[PDB]
Structure 1
């Protein structure tokens, strides 16, 4: 039987990867004064969200999957669900804020210096987490998301069962707040940035005539590891409520595909040469 020892190894490796990467990024930004920049506060917020997710959400879900029972109390089921939703929405919204910051950096270069002051770059982060917590903790803990049918009531009345059942309203509102609004903004921002880059290369070629792969590669790496990781989940999240069409195993698998996005963020964003120097100093 390889379906007990085997899936544990993969889950443990995911936990180790997430924890190691996020801890390294956080300590590199904290220890070195050169890396302290307005752009790097969004990165440290994202790293904090990913580290919390890797420490809390993944291990208990892994234990639940491997054991098929919930030994802990009934309070901890709702606490764990609330933490899961909070971390996911905070991470995605920080990803949106980073793209908006880059839009403001390239599109308007003269007014960028005054706009993103270090003092005003903290209110944005404090608002992101508050908005994340107003949709994660408050609706779940007040018991406003609860479903109404025999399976849901039986699940809620048992102390060893912890499965996600939700209404139509909460599912739709949660998906809209967490995914689609932060997606349209990123699409618009990155399209405009690509346009500006193309114009710049056109000017260079027209000027130094005698003597778009990079932009496409960078935008593909940024926007193909996010849509592919999170888009499949937020469609079944609506479908399984509108209509038996979606089975539970597919839902759980598509949920767990979106968790590994936390382990890839340091590769995508913490790739500058200064980060490489800082990582070299810390480890070796």
Structure 2
């Protein structure tokens, strides 16, 4: 009986993402508009699109146990969720990067970044994210070469994920490896600067540690479990089941649901 009841959990979670995210988008535009708020707005928009156009489809497929639309719709759904997941993570790297000059180069921060530069970098990162998902999905260049995906690719009623090794490795790298190390290095330096500034202040006459630890831990704990198996199950010989795959993917999806709650805590907000 828990199968029917679990559908309420998905509906309750999905409705929160759509309702929660539009609260900060409308407030920023109608009231707040600074150089560092465009990235937050872009991240919020990406999260809203991902939630609205991904979560109900996956929930319906899981509950009904039979995909209803055709092959084109399934390809579109895979392309859109890959694109949205790739673009959501990469914005945090930009946030970490630009918060670094403010602390590390206070004088040149104003001259380094402006509205035009922020718009250009946002467009560039969005194009980089989009090129990873739509182009291989539409070109059918990621198809597997085994005898298990033939039924999935030949049946319009069925739908699953059986992507080849090379595309999976490349996507996992370009979506998780690059941002993580950069953001780790950025946040390490920021802590050192605070410490000197705290040590210098003490010489003249753990909130930062707590907040950096929380910021790091929330998304690393939500995302690393999902992106750690995308290499393992392909490399291994059927050592990872599919239910755990779906569960970890949903856990990774959960992160961006409360990411805007972790962020956007300024007094003016």
Structure 2 length as normaliser, TM-score? 0.97
Give, in whole Å, the separation in 2 of the partners of 1:136 and 1:109: 37
Give, in whole Å, the separation in 2 of the partners of 1:55 and 1:231: 23
Give, in whole Å, the separation in 2 of the partners of 1:99 and 1:17: 27
Give, in whole Å, the separation in 2 of the partners of 1:136 and 1:186: 23
Give, in whole Å, the separation in 2 of the partners of 1:72 and 1:10: 24
Note the C-alpha offset of 1:22.
1.0
Give, in whole Å, the separation in 2 of the partners of 1:182 and 1:147: 28
CA RMSD of aligned residues (A): 1.3
Runs of 4+ in 1 over 6 A off after TM superposition: none
Structure 2 alignment gaps of length 5 or more: none
Of the structure 1 ranges 8-17 and 194-203, higher mean CA displacement relative to structure 2 is found in 8-17
Residue of structure 2 in register with 1:28 after alignment: 27
Q: What's the secondary structure of 2:193's corresponding residue?
A: helix
Note the C-alpha offset of 1:3.
2.6
Give, in whole Å, the separation in 2 of the partners of 1:262 and 1:5: 26
Give, in whole Å, the separation in 2 of the partners of 1:8 and 1:43: 31
Aligned residues: 267
Q: Deviations over 1:98-119 (max 9, x none)?
A: 1111112111100000111011
Note the C-alpha offset of 1:226.
0.6
Give, in whole Å, the separation in 1 of the partners of 2:137 and 2:163: 10
Structure 1 alignment gaps of length 5 or more: 275-284
* Larger RCO: 1 or 2 (CA < 8 Å, sep 6+): 1
Give, in whole Å, the separation in 2 of the partners of 1:214 and 1:100: 21
Q: What's the secondary structure of 1:163's corresponding residue?
A: coil
Note the C-alpha offset of 1:168.
1.1
Give, in whole Å, the separation in 1 of the partners of 2:4 and 2:152: 28
Note the C-alpha offset of 1:140.
1.1
From 142, 145, 161, the equivalent of 1:145 is: 142
